[PDB]
Amino acid sequence: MAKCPICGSPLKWEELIEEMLIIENFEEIVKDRERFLAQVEEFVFKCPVCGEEFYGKTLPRREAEKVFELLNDFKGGIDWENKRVKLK
Numbered sequence: 001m002a003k004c005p006i007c008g009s010p011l012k013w014e015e016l017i018e019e020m021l022i023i024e025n026f027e028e029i030v031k032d033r034e035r036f037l038a039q040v041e042e043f044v045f046k047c048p049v050c051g052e053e054f055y056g057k058t059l060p061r062r063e064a065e066k067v068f069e070l071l072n073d074f075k076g077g078i079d080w081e082n083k084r085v086k087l088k
């Protein structure tokens with residue numbers, strides 16, 4: 001689970017992958033954990049609760065280990081044609 005550093009409202013990790021699955025380079029980033037964690041810290045995200053932008057470099061050190069879990073737990077409930085992402 002992700003939290004906003006401006007308002008402090010709950011965010012889902014399944015919504016971030018589903019909204020960012022519109023890029024063709026994403027199929028190459030999903031195979032390497034070192035490129036996915038470095039891209040989240042360098043890129044900024046928008047909050048639908050407050051409206052202000054938050055960076056992946058200002059997030060906690062325990063949530064960064066949760067990103068390794070989506071990359072490692074591949075094949076099962078992830079479809080490219082139907083655009084469905086599952087997190088365990």
Ligand SMILES: [Zn+2]
Pocket residue numbers: 004005006007008009047049050051052
């Ligand atoms: Zn917010």
